[PDB]
């Protein structure tokens, strides 16, 4: 889904379809960020909460 297709989707005005194509139908990921430093250095352990 190259850049020209992205431009066509922008021209159509469909932001939801573009977001879904580039996230859900592709590499979606979840990260944790510190609310102070703003870096992705949070050592998150989901099972221990």
Q: Among the candidate windows 2-10, 17-25, 30-38, which touches Zn ion by CB under 5 A?
A: 30-38
Beta carbons of 21 and 12 less than 8 angstroms apart? no
- Which of 20, 18, 19 shows the shortest CA–CA distance to 5? 18
By CB under 7 A, is residue 13 in contact with DNA? no
By CB under 7 A, is residue 27 in contact with DNA? no
From the list DNA, Zn ion, none, partner contacted by residue 34 (C-beta under 5 to 8 A by kind)? Zn ion
The tokens for 1 are 């889904």
Distance CA(36)–CA(31), nearest Å, equals 15
Residue numbers in the known binding site for Zn(2+) are 34, 37
Residues that bind DNA (CB under 7 A): 2-4
């Amino acid at each position: 889904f190259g850049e020209m297709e992205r431009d066509c989707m922008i021209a159509h005005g469909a932001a939801g379809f573009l977001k879904e194509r580039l996230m859900e139908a592709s590499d979606a990921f979840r990260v944790h960020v510190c609310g102070i430093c703003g870096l992705m250095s949070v050592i998150a352990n989901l099972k221990k909460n």
